[PDB]
Amino acid sequence: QSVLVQMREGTPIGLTGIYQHPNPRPALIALYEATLKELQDKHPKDSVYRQSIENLTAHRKQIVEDNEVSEVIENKIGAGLIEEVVIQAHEELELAKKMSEWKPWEELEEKPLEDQWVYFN
């Protein structure tokens, strides 16, 4: 199934270019479940990245799943508006999908020279 994360036409809210999203909570929780499924499937369980984003979207999804109205959860999240929260959840989801192929949990591949991060000391 597909999900819409940002209406570009509708009634206006304070941020221009961003209009009011119909039914933001099912979009939100399905996008969350995609985040949880991707980082459980593709990142190895040592790595700090998947651990904090797992805990992050779990604690974020708990607020969405357990409270109903618009304004109270957009205060309890503490980030922006719910349209904007859906956009940044979409964004961290696309990030977590790029990280499975860019693979950041390795050791570093390009060691610096010893005389390079030396400024004036």
By C-beta, is 41 or 121 nearer to another protein? 121
Kindly state whether residue 67 participates in binding another protein, applying the rule CB under 8 A. no
Residue with tokens 């990030």: 95
What binding mask, one character per residue, do residues 23-52 give for another protein by CB under 8 A, x or -? --------x--x-----------xxxx-xx
The least CB distance from residue 116 to another protein, in Å, is 6
User: Does residue 98 belong to the site contacting another protein (CB under 8 A)?
Assistant: yes
By CB under 8 A, tell whether 91 contacts another protein.
yes
> Which structure tokens are listed for 12?
């206006």
Angle CA 61–63–69, to nearest 5 = 120
Binding flag, residue 68, another protein (CB under 8 A): no
Other beta carbons within 10 Å of 95: 14
DSSP state of 117: S
Which of 37, 56, 65, 67 binds another protein (CB under 8 A)? It is 56
In sequence order, the β-bridge partners of residue 19 are 12
Amino acid (one-letter) located at 121? N
DSSP reduced 3-state for 12: strand
Q: How far apart are CA 11 and CA 105, in angstroms?
A: 43
Footprint of another protein on this chain (CB under 8 A)? Answer: 1-9, 11-18, 31, 34, 46-49, 51-53, 55-56, 59-60, 63, 70-71, 74-81, 87-92, 94-95, 98-99, 102-113, 115-121
